[PDB]
Structure formats: structure tokens, C-alpha cells
């Protein structure tokens, strides 16, 4: 049974929200969940997903200050995804392969008494994300533009970046956050091949980076190497790791919603940091071992498809009650087989190319 959320948005505030859908200015609202009521602020989120009648929302809790351990969450329509499950499937997969990852759950929402349908509630990657995992304080940075590429170089300027911390929103930060990020970006690029094995681990959690890279390769987020992630600098270990975000264009479909034909991602992935690490024999062997471990445990039909089937079964009766989705249950139903075929094809490609890491 999906959690049912009943939102109230006062008509005056709803007019303001609908006046400029591109605005990032929130309006007050209320959430009722069971018997408990929450004063909140709500705003549309995303870019192209604002064009849909089934809008996506960023919900910020005001009073009470927290909802199930969080001060905010995201409500995605996942309308581009005919399955509504690829983002959850992906982010849970990252968790299962040992990468820090947002939790998510499907929910059923109403606004002002009118069903809006099935949404994916996504955890905000912020200080509560850390606290709820027992993780140390530190900094969280969101990749927001092309300068979040792990390089010294700005593509647009065709020159060295003016600031090496460029490309990120500082979501949770302190006085050291800029310099910590700048140092990481600089050292990722400035350490020689001969110094890399002994020194990159002073700045980067290499195993967690390689597991994130593996996750991008397995899910095939074509834009996942320089976008669609957050960085976390753990202040106790002094190391960076990478947290995925926005993984709906995965498991056999691209960002336009189209089935992949013969499009694929090479197993080495992309971005300069990946390239520098995979020039190091120890790290190439480590990465190969990670891919083999995941191929043996998580990235299999036997293991993934029960999760696909459980997600679909849990939301299907609610999709029939969703005014935007009620007509495309047949297409929805066909997505499990598409994902299964993708796993089989992707497994074969990765297995066939592991020798490139030798
Ligand atoms: Mg608040
Ligand atoms: Mg550090
Ligand atoms: Mg996207
Ligand atoms: Mg190389």
C-alpha cells in the first residue's frame, strides 16, 4: 500500500505557483499524512519536467521541522519514464553495490482534493541524509553545470577554470568547503601517473569512486559522468565520494525516453578522473574486480527482476487511478520485459569487454 499524501495549496498561492512555472520561489502549503498535518513550502522542481501537467515538486517542511527524519524531499512525477521505476531501481542498485545513495518510495498524492497520481518521493542529499546514515559532518556539493567535470578545464572558456570549485551548488558547506573541493579537483588532475596510486587516496575514496563509476556503467546514465551526482567530503576521513542523482534515463531508455538501439557506454566510462585512475594498474584491477563482483551478485536477472516486479505490482493499481497514467497501463506493463532484455544485453557487453582492463 502506497503512502497517501493530501496536499492543500490555498487558491491564492496556487495562482502564484502556476503564474510562472519556471520560478524557484516556493509558496506555502499543507500536507496531511494519516492523522498528522504539516505546514510546508512547495515549489516546482526540475527543468523540462515542469512542462508536464503532472508537475514535480520540492517540498520543504516548516512546522514540524522534520518529516520521517528529513527537512525536505522531492516528489518526481517520473513522467518521462513509462515504467515510473527506473530512478528508484537505479538509486537502490547504487546502494546495493556499496555507493551512498538517496532512498526513495512511491507515493500517491492529491492536491486540493484532486488526485495527481503516483509519484516517486526522493530523499534530499543534505545534512539529514548524512545524519540518518550515521555519517560524519562535512560538505555536500551538487553538480549543476558543465564545469562539474573533474577537470582543470572549462569547455566553454577553452581555458583553465577561473575557479576549480566551479560547477557545483554548495548545498551543505562550511568555511573550508571551497578549498577542499578546489584541492580535490586540482590534485585529481595534477598528480602524476607515478604519484597517483600513493596520493589520490589522500583526497578521494577510491573504492567508492570506482563503485559509483561501475553503477553509471551498469545503469547507463549517459550523462552521469559530469552531471547527475553530488559530492560528499567526509570531514573525519578527509575524503570525497560521489552520490548519484536523477537516474531515470537508465535501464534501456535514453533521456528523450527512447529505447536504446545500439547506443552503449564503454566500461571505462568518462571524465578525466576516471581516465587517470584507469591508467593505474592497481586501480584497473580494483575496478575490474568491482565489475566482476557486481556481475556475480547484483546485475543479474534473477536478482534485479524480482525488484522490478515488486515495484510494478505495488504501483499498478494506483496507476489505474492516476489521471495522467490511467490510459497507458499496457505500455507500463511492457517495461519489465524491456528492462530484463536490457540486463541481458548489458551483461554480455560488459563481460565481453572486461579484458580491456587487464
Ligand atoms: Mg524547514
Ligand atoms: Mg579532504
Ligand atoms: Mg535528467
Ligand atoms: Mg588510459
CB atoms within 10 A of CB 292: 14
Which range marks the domain in which residue 31 is found?
4-76+101-123
For the chain, what is the radius of gyration of the CA atoms? 21
CB atoms within 10 A of CB 76: 26
Does the annotation list 262 as a binding residue? no
Residue 305 within any structural domain of the chain = no
Does the annotation list 333 as a binding residue? no
Resolution, rounded to a tenth of an Å? 1.6
- Say how many Å lie between the first and final Cα of the chain, rounded: 48
CB contact at 8 A, 85 and 313 = no
Residue 203 within any structural domain of the chain = no
> Separation of 313 CA from ligand 3 center, angstroms?
25
Neighbours of ion ligand 4 (CB under 5 A): 279
> Separation of 55 CA from ligand 1 center, angstroms?
22
Which of 69, 20, 71 is CA-nearest to residue 41? 71
Q: Which ligand is nearest to the CA of 196?
A: 4
Cα–Cα distance, 138 to 345 (Å, whole number): 40
**Domain tally, the chain:** 1
Which of 48, 40, 50 is CA-nearest to residue 20? 50
Residue 110 within any structural domain of the chain = yes
CB contact at 8 A, 26 and 42 = yes
Residue 112 within any structural domain of the chain = yes
| Maximum CA extent, the chain | 64
CB contact at 8 A, 26 and 41 = yes
> Separation of 272 CA from ligand 3 center, angstroms?
21
Does the annotation list 61 as a binding residue? yes
> Separation of 226 CA from ligand 3 center, angstroms?
12
In the chain, alpha helices (H): 11-19, 86-96, 127-132, 177-190, 193-199, 206-219, 272-277, 281-297, 301-319, 329-353
CA distances from 76 to 9, 57, 184, 229 (A): 18, 6, 32, 17
Does the annotation list 238 as a binding residue? yes
Q: Please calculate the CA angle 271-138-149 and round it to the nearest 5 degrees.
A: 15
The answer to whether the Cα torsion of 217, 218, 223, 228 is positive or negative is: negative
Residue 177 within any structural domain of the chain = no
Where does residue 209 fall: left (phi above 0), alpha (psi -120 to 50 degrees), or beta otherwise?
Answer: alpha
Backbone φ and ψ for 173, nearest 5 degrees, come out as -155, 170
> Separation of 113 CA from ligand 3 center, angstroms?
30
CB contact at 8 A, 294 and 353 = no
Cα–Cα distance, 106 to 253 (Å, whole number): 20
Beta bridge partners of 59: 42, 73
The answer to whether the Cα torsion of 150, 202, 204, 174 is positive or negative is: negative
Does the annotation list 169 as a binding residue? yes
Which of 274, 294, 286 is CA-nearest to residue 350? 294
> Separation of 227 CA from ligand 4 center, angstroms?
21
Cα–Cα distance, 238 to 18 (Å, whole number): 44
The DSSP 8-state label assigned to residue 111 in this structure reads E
Which of 57, 84, 90 is CA-nearest to residue 73? 57
Does the annotation list 258 as a binding residue? no
Cα–Cα distance, 92 to 94 (Å, whole number): 5
Backbone φ and ψ for 319, nearest 5 degrees, come out as -65, -35
Which of 179, 71, 85, 196 is CA-nearest to residue 125? 71
Q: Which ligand is nearest to the CA of 250?
A: 3
> Separation of 59 CA from ligand 1 center, angstroms?
9
| C-alpha cell of residue 119 | 509519484
Residue 262 within any structural domain of the chain = no
Does the annotation list 246 as a binding residue? yes
Long-range contacts of 177-182 (CB under 8 A, 24+ apart): 177/139, 177/141, 177/233, 180/139, 180/233, 181/139, 181/141, 181/231, 181/233
Long-range contacts of 133-136 (CB under 8 A, 24+ apart): 133/100, 135/100, 135/232, 135/234, 136/234, 136/235, 136/236, 136/237
Residue with cell 585529481: 188
> Separation of 264 CA from ligand 3 center, angstroms?
17
Does the annotation list 266 as a binding residue? no
Q: Which ligand is nearest to the CA of 176?
A: 2
Kind of pairing, strands 4-8 and 104-111?
Answer: parallel
- Angle, helices 281-297/206-219, rounded to nearest 10 degrees: 50
Residue 22 within any structural domain of the chain = yes
> Separation of 222 CA from ligand 3 center, angstroms?
10
Does the annotation list 245 as a binding residue? yes
Residue 60 within any structural domain of the chain = yes
CB atoms within 10 A of CB 169: 13
> Separation of 309 CA from ligand 4 center, angstroms?
39
Asked how this structure was determined, the answer is X-ray
> Separation of 184 CA from ligand 2 center, angstroms?
7
CB contact at 8 A, 236 and 136 = yes
Q: Which ligand is nearest to the CA of 179?
A: 2
Q: Report the residue count for the chain.
A: 358
CB contact at 8 A, 105 and 267 = no
Q: Which ligand is nearest to the CA of 283?
A: 4
Amino acid at each position: 500500500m502506497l503512502p497517501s499524501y493530501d496536499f492543500f495549496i490555498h487558491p491564492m498561492n496556487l495562482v502564484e505557483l502556476k503564474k510562472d512555472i519556471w520560478s524557484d520561489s516556493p509558496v506555502p502549503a499543507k500536507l496531511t499524512y494519516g492523522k498528522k498535518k504539516y505546514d510546508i513550502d512547495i515549489v516546482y522542481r526540475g527543468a523540462h519536467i515542469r512542462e508536464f501537467e503532472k508537475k514535480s515538486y520540492h517540498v520543504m517542511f516548516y512546522k514540524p521541522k522534520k518529516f520521517q527524519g528529513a527537512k525536505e524531499f522531492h516528489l518526481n512525477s517520473e513522467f518521462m519514464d513509462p515504467s515510473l521505476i527506473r530512478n528508484k531501481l537505479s538509486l537502490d542498485f547504487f546502494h546495493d553495490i556499496g555507493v551512498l545513495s538517496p532512498k526513495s518510495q512511491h507515493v500517491f498524492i492529491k492536491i486540493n482534493g484532486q488526485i495527481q497520481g503516483v509519484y516517486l518521493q526522493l530523499e534530499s542529499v543534505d545534512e539529514n541524509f548524512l545524519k540518518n546514515r550515521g555519517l560524519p559532518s562535512g560538505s555536500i556539493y551538487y553538480a549543476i553545470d558543465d564545469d562539474a567535470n573533474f577537470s582543470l578545464m572549462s569547455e566553454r572558456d577553452k581555458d583553465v577554470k577561473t575557479e576549480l570549485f566551479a560547477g557545483y551548488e554548495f548545498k551543505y558547506s562550511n568555511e573550508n568547503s571551497e578549498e577542499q573541493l578546489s584541492e580535490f579537483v586540482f590534485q585529481a588532475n595534477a598528480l602524476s601517473r607515478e604519484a597517483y596510486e600513493k596520493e589520490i587516496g589522500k583526497f578521494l575514496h577510491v573504492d567508492k569512486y570506482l563503485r559509483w563509476l561501475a553503477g553509471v556503467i551498469f545503469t547507463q546514465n549517459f550523462d552521469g559522468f559530469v552531471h547527475n551526482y553530488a559530492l560528499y567530503h567526509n570531514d573525519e576521513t578527509n575524503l570525497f565520494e560521489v552520490i548519484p542523482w536523477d537516474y531515470d534515463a537508465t535501464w534501456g531508455r535514453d533521456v528523450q525516453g527512447r529505447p536504446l538501439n545500439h547506443e552503449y557506454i564503454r566500461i571505462q566510462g568518462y571524465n578525466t578522473l576516471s581516465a587517470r585512475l584507469l591508467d593505474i594498474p592497481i586501480f584497473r584491477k580494483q575496478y575490474r574486480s568491482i565489475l566482476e563482483e557486481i556481475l556475480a551478485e547484483q546485475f543479474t536477472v534473477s536478482f534485479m527482476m524480482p525488484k522490478v516486479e515488486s515495484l510494478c505490482e505495488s504501483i499498478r493499481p494506483y496507476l489505474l487511478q492516476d489521471p495522467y497514467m490511467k490510459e497507458k497501463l499496457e505500455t507500463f506493463d511492457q517495461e519489465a520485459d524491456m528492462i530484463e532484455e536490457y540486463i541481458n544485453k548489458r551483461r554480455k557487453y560488459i563481460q565481453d569487454h572486461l579484458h580491456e582492463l587487464d
